[PDB]
Structure 1
């Protein structure tokens, strides 16, 4: 007597949506074309989960959520590093490992009635007034579902299938921005004032704001920090023609990382950093009329890294949707319709504060404390 749902994509948002719909009693099947990540056979290593992200997770799986979330490191504020290495504490997010979080969600799903189908690529959907026929490559295969949830990322195959059934406003924009993953190792000895082998304070998000480029650092449980450099494709491509050019760039702009980061390794991470396509995506509506499908996460609204908070937004997507389904007593057609109306309102504002955040933190940086004169 239960309805079936296909959830396309077992990233962070797909796993959470599957937990939520299995909890609510739907017959959930969760698809991904990738292999089970938990086998020996990630856009970042540790990520920040916000209070709102945590609450979404809590609303959906209260039991698991504390087990899922207790290696996470609470951040009390941001620490701003200037060109002279001065650090300013600005008191207020929690640091958590991406792979660990994704795997824990998969583990919780295994305790559920959810069917996990890895190595299944959605290629086509036939939409009807009854069940939706999902075509997979696994070897073509079809399966029928009462409805479909697209959690399949910025390039959503689901979204493209939906566009055939509904008139969807849609935009994609490839941003100039690139990011490079850097690493700050644990210290040799335990540091009492920090509560671990941390080179710098682990209870702050560290930010080295510069003019249209930036370094950040976020603590990992083992004392290390996940660090990320952000800059334009042109700036980075201009730098990495020369190892010496990269090295001197880092020393000049981030002098207080020289002692805590392997600069020779950092240079190599710059030079050999892989091809990236950061794309921003928006669309309207998020649903196929009659409750037949809905888009959550990056599939609905891929946004700019750091200035936007995509995982947190996607987690909030799921919480909002479940509350609407409950408000409508399981009427998916009316719930999905209200979801697209109210979420789009939210997301224009979210995109609004993201750009404003870009403006104050990275565009408007000309002070002598933050911009070098040479």
Structure 2
């Protein structure tokens, strides 16, 4: 292989691709939107499961490191008042496909395993264009670059897939509001104490709460519901007041301990749940070698655990396919990775869609 591989986007998935290819002596750059490595990453914590994510980390020789930094959480399920089922983590079961790792910590682990200057920061891919033997890649206000194989790994909202497929992101019907409380021990003490160093989830009449009281000392929480008829949007995530107003109304029946969790949030993030659905087969005729992995390839609703792990397998199976050297052409290696990922991906989205229907039914319980 006289060639080089341009990975667009250094997510947890993208950076794993980079690592798995780099250890096999392949030329690779990671082109990342973010301004620099220290950029804060919003979101809850990721956890790598024993069969999938953990297995890719293992192959990058990074499991022990991920274990070091990850923190196993128990789980409390509560009503709109007090505790219904506690699930502390059993000692022989702690490394078990749970260790909750902070999204920045995981990037810090991945980046560290890569050779210096593998990732190029302040690189926003806005355009893609097939040349003679090379993809010319266009980055907003930066010098453009060229690669032999583009791997799209830029998340659920990738604007740059036309060369692989015509399908487009869909809204699934649900919606998520998310925030971080800092010093949750004094800022939302009642709620802090409900969690009792465990993760917490509660559901009441089509609203779901999920909180993790120790994401590197910040309480992160998400509230989730069916997207209201009114919208299609009519709450403004700029004014914290409209969000507060709306949340307090929806959470009227809930305990003071949760309401205090809304009042204290300085700012909220809104998001419609989306799916990049694995319905059609992707494009056959492809001018030069291009493929997609992680959320770019199969964005799917979060609610049932799924997300990064499928995207981490995508890295495991593609790197092997491009490295173990079984196929006669890059073009075969991709097609083979894709044949497989369509199987376990659809399997997953299906389970995901399902659980999303199941839990936003007006009568759901985690029981």
Sort the TM-score into its range (normalised by shorter chain): 0.7 to 0.9
Instruction: Give how far 1:72 is off.
Output: 1.2
Alignment of 1:48 onto 2:51:
no
Instruction: Give how far 1:157 is off.
Output: 3.7
Partner of 1:309: 306
> C-alpha root-mean-square deviation of aligned residues, in Å?
3.5
Aligned equivalents of 2:202, 2:33: Cα separation in 1:
38
Aligned equivalents of 1:248, 1:128: Cα separation in 2:
56
Deviations 1:120-163 (A, max 9, x none): 23233332563323233335x34332211111122324413x14
Aligned with 1:220 (options 190, 214, 218): 214
Aligned equivalents of 2:156, 2:180: Cα separation in 1:
24
Mapping for residues 254-269 of structure 1, pairs under 5 Å: 254=255, 257=258, 262-266=261-265, 269=267
Deviations 1:269-295 (A, max 9, x none): 4xxx34535432135428875871110
Are 1:154 and 1:299, in contact at CA under 8 Å, matched by a contact in 2?
A: yes
Mapping for residues 142-161 of structure 1, pairs under 5 Å: 142-160=144-162
Mapping for residues 117-156 of structure 1, pairs under 5 Å: 117-128=120-131, 130-139=133-142, 141-156=143-158
Partner of 2:189: none
Aligned equivalents of 1:22, 1:75: Cα separation in 2:
33
- How many residue pairs get matched? 343
Instruction: Give how far 1:5 is off.
Output: 0.5
Aligned with 2:170 (options 170, 173, 177): 173
Instruction: Give how far 1:254 is off.
Output: 4.4
TM-score by length of 2: 0.78
CA 24–114 in structure 1, closer or farther in 2 if over 3 Å, else same = farther
Partner of 1:191: none
Instruction: Give how far 1:169 is off.
Output: 4.5
| Unaligned 5+ runs, structure 2 | 187-191
Aligned with 1:281 (options 276, 286, 296): 276
Deviations 1:57-90 (A, max 9, x none): 423321x4423442312235x4211234132135
CA 229–39 in structure 1, closer or farther in 2 if over 3 Å, else same = closer
Partner of 1:74: 72
Deviations 1:320-357 (A, max 9, x none): 22233345436422221111111112122111111222
Instruction: Give how far 1:296 is off.
Output: 0.8
Partner of 2:29: 29
CA 123–251 in structure 1, closer or farther in 2 if over 3 Å, else same = closer
Instruction: Give how far 1:249 is off.
Output: 4.9
Deviations 1:146-186 (A, max 9, x none): 211111122324413x14xxxx3513212441222253745
| Unaligned 5+ runs, structure 1 | 189-196
Are 1:73 and 1:221, in contact at CA under 8 Å, matched by a contact in 2?
A: no
Aligned equivalents of 1:345, 1:39: Cα separation in 2:
35
Instruction: Give how far 1:7 is off.
Output: 0.6
Aligned equivalents of 1:291, 1:328: Cα separation in 2:
19
Aligned with 2:113 (options 108, 111, 135): 108
Aligned equivalents of 2:145, 2:216: Cα separation in 1:
44
Aligned equivalents of 2:211, 2:38: Cα separation in 1:
26
Instruction: Give how far 1:49 is off.
Output: 3.4
CA 287–25 in structure 1, closer or farther in 2 if over 3 Å, else same = farther
Aligned equivalents of 1:17, 1:95: Cα separation in 2:
21
Alignment of 1:355 onto 2:349:
no
